[model samples]
Target: MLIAFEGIDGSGKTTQAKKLYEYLKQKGYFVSLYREPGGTKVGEVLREILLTEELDERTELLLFEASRSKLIEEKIIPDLKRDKVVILDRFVLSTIAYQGYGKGLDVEFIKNLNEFATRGVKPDITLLLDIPVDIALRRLKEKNRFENKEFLEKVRKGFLELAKEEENVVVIDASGEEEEVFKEILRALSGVL
Candidate 1:
């Protein structure tokens, strides 16, 4: 199963992703956790430029997709072929929320591009760690290109809308304590896993 965690930055998706990975490992499941934009070597290079460069919105979108394509081709596909559970900190949904919604790009075009980049691979389950933009902003210590409040609000809205449309997506209230949030994720996974 490919499990992807989605949210604005600092929404504790990574923490929950790692926790689930460890939990499944303890249960003897062959699981691997990988983060987007930095999973493979090519991804890492794209990630550095993605972080530091002031890129055009289209350039930014393509770079993210490029990184995702490399990660999918190199790591995600092979693991799934071997029947290992794959956990992704971010995935195709991030591009929709960030590039399409936040950047005001065309959603349908972005969605198609995502399909092209991923080559039809989709997560079995997506956990959206939903939170308000204000709440999420406070959790971030480093200011980055993706951290503008107004933009994040739009992205958050887009994410909520996308979650509603996705059949396998579970929207979790992430404005709680760490263990509380973790428990909610596990509860959601209980039925599927």
Candidate 2:
């Protein structure tokens, strides 16, 4: 099965993805963990440019899709063919959220690009970790060049819209303690598993 964990930055989706990987491993399941935009060698370089540069929204969206395509061709499909459960830290939903909505790009265009990049491989389950904009921003250290409040607000709203529209997505509250949030994720997984 292919599962993806998605959310805005500092929303704890990556943390929970690792937790789920460990949980499934402990249960003797063959599982692999990966993060989007850098899951493969070619993608790693593209990830740097996409995240660090202030490219136009359409360019940025294409770059993200490029990286995603590399990940699928190199890592995701092979694992799935082996009957291993693959958990991705982020996926095409991020492209839609960050570029389509957050950056005000044409949503339909982004969706078409995403479809081409992913080759129509949808996640069986998508965990959307939800957290308030204020709280999520506070959790980030003041280091990165992209650490700003205005951009994050748009990204957060974009994710909220995704959770509302997607059927495979399950929104989990990311407030409170880490364990508490993880417990909610586990509960969500039970219904799908």
Candidate 3:
């Protein structure tokens, strides 16, 4: 199964994904974890420019999609074909939320572009760790250069809105303790996987 985790910065996507990957592995499931915009060597460079440095929003969005495409074509598809459970820290939903809605671009158009990027490899399950804008901003502080409150607020709203409309998405309250959120994710996964 392909599982993708989506949320604003500091939403604990990496921490939870790693935890879940380890849990699944312990259960004898063939699992692999990947982070978008940096899953591969080339993607790491794009991630740095897109997240750690300044870039045009449109440029960043395109780079994000490009990196995702590389991951899908190279890493994700091959693993899935081999019966591995792939857990992605972020995926196409992120592009739709961040660039399309948060950045004030056309959401429907961005969604279409994301579809093209992933080539229809939609996740079987998506975990959306939803948090209030202020909470997310607080957690994200001192983490990276993209720590703008206004930007994060926009991203938070974007994620929540998208999660609401997505059928495969499970929105978890990230404001709670890590274990609490993890419980929610595992509960959802129990039924899917």
lDDT of each: 0.90, 0.85, 0.86
- For candidate 1, what is the TM-score? 0.95
Using all chains and alpha carbons, the TM-scores for the candidates as numbered come to: 0.95, 0.93, 0.93
lDDT at position 15, candidate 1? 89
> Judged by lDDT against the true structure, how good is candidate 2?
0.85
Give lDDT tens digits, candidate 2, residues 1-193.
9888888888887888999999999998899998888888889999888768888877777778888998888888888899899999988788888887788888888888988988888998898888887788777754342466788788888888888887689888988788998889888888777
Q: How badly does each model clash, as a count of residue pairs?
A: 0, 0, 0
Whichever of 1 and 3 has more lDDT, that candidate is: 1
C-alpha lDDT of residue 52 in model 2: 89
- The reply for model 1, stretches above 4 Å from the true place, is 141-146
Tell how far residue 20 is off in model 3, in angstroms: 0.5
Ranking by lDDT: 1, 3, 2
lDDT of 1 by residue, 102-121 (tens): 98899999999999988999
Determine the C-alpha RMSD for candidate 1 after optimal superposition of all C-alphas. Answer: 1.8
